Amino acid sequence: YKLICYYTSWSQYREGDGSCFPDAIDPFLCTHVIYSFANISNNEIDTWEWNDVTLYDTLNTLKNRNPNLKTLLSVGGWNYGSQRFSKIASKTQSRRTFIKSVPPFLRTHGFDGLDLAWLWPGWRDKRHLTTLVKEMKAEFVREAQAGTEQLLLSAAVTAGKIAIDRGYDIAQISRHLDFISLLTYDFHGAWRQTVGHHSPLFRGNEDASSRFSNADYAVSYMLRLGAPANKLVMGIPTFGRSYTLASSKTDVGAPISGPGIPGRFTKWKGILAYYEICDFLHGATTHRFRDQQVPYATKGNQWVAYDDQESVKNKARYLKNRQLAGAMVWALDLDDFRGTFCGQNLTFPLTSAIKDVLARV
Ligand SMILES: *[C@@H]1O[C@H](CO)[C@@H](O)[C@H](O)[C@H]1NC(C)=O
Numbered sequence: 318y319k320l321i322c323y324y325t326s327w328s329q330y331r332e333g334d335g336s337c338f339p340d341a342i343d344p345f346l347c348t349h350v351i352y353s354f355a356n357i358s359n360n361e362i363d364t365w366e367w368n369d370v371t372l373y374d375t376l377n378t379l380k381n382r383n384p385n386l387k388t389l390l391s392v393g394g395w396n397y398g399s400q401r402f403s404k405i406a407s408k409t410q411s412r413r414t415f416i417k418s419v420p421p422f423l424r425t426h427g428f429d430g431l432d433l434a435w436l437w438p439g440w441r442d443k444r445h446l447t448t449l450v451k452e453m454k455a456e457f458v459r460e461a462q463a464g465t466e467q468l469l470l471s472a473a474v475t476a477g478k479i480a481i482d483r484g485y486d487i488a489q490i491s492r493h494l495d496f497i498s499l500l501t502y503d504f505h506g507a508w509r510q511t512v513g514h515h516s517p518l519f520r521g522n523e524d525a526s527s528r529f530s531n532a533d534y535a536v537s538y539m540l541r542l543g544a545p546a547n548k549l550v551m552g553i554p555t556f557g558r559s560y561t562l563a564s565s566k567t568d569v570g571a572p573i574s575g576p577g578i579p580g581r582f583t584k585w586k587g588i589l590a591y592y593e594i595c596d597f598l599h600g601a602t603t604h605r606f607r608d609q610q611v612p613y614a615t616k617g618n619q620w621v622a623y624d625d626q627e628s629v630k631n632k633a634r635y636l637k638n639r640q641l642a643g644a645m646v647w648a649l650d651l652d653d654f655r656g657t658f659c660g661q662n663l664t665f666p667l668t669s670a671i672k673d674v675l676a677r678v
């Protein structure tokens with residue numbers, strides 16, 4: 318199985334124990350660690366943080382302890398636009414400049430491959446993403462001739478049917494990519510006016526205003542569109558999403574006034590790290606959505622949809638049953654990477670729960 322795990326550049330700046338550098342990562346926890354995100358500047362891949370060259374080195378030193386570990390660098394992300402990516406991919410000359418720049422930069426910084434994180438191609442972009450993926454893979458095949466193991470190419474792909482149909486020619490890109498990480502954890506957000514889970518495995522009996530908004534639907538769709546099982550990697554979040562409740566109702570359908578208050582460490586309304594959530598659960602009431610097979614918890618006017626050891630194992634059993642290539646984790650710095658928040662003295666509880674299921678029968 319693969320266990321693809323993202324590390325984010327910006328996690329280093331969090332206050333106190335929220336601070337996460339790549340030497341916090343257990344070299345043997347994942348099979349591939351993806352460093353997020355690289356910029357494109359002068360139409361060439363580039364660093365983002367002032368000290369990315371140092372942290373790339375820190376990450377890459379993990380292979381001293383675990384020489385089988387693979388690393389990739391993800392270009393794109395939310396701060397980088399969609400529109401910035403569109404401009405590069407849609408013109409043959411910009412596209413070539415970009416593609417040429419990638420292998421030398423990766424080899425300089427000790428990465429084994431590139432992850433494409435264009436978030437996200439519009440309907441005018443679908444055909445240009447196809448061309449980008451094909452041409453980038455061709456450049457990697459060419460570069461392998463110089464004697465070093467061929468660079469890997471992956472892509473992060475959103476899990477909503479509408480976004481997939483808008484931007485991605487899944488049958489074509491899957492031919493050239495070594496794996497596709499499906500982002501099966503953005504199925505609900507504060508843009509809705511109610512509580513709901515963003516990473517349910519199934520729809521649940523609840524109701525079907527929108528069937529589609531669940532991981533099973535997305536995995537089945539990707540396979541239907543021609544992504545081989547052996548290239549499809551299912552995303553599992555270590556963060557949860559929070560809401561501020563509008564009423565005392567806490568239940569399926571409960572109204573919401575906006576995202577939840579910011580976490581003490583992650584400081585972003587509407588999201589919490591798992592370590593923050595372990596703290597939140599003290600004094601909270603816990604519930605599971607039985608049909609959707611994922612938990613939520615509530616305290617005061619705050620309501621948090623999240624994943625725990627049981628729901629992540631359950632997702633790992635599911636993707637092994639569908640014979641997928643493995644799991645992707647967003648993100649290592651949002652698991653309890655210190656191991657000191659969740660009452661069990663165990664670093665990366667959620668990621669090691671996934672790893673242990675994948676390792677069994
Ligand atoms: C990314 O590249 C753009 C385009 O050159 C540049 O304007 C921007 O400052 C870069 N961002 C960072 C954080 O380096």
Ligand SMILES: C[N+](C)(C)CCCC=O
Binds near residue numbers: 325584585588648651
């Ligand atoms: C917004 N945070 C807290 C940086 C996390 C954003 C999703 C980050 O990984």
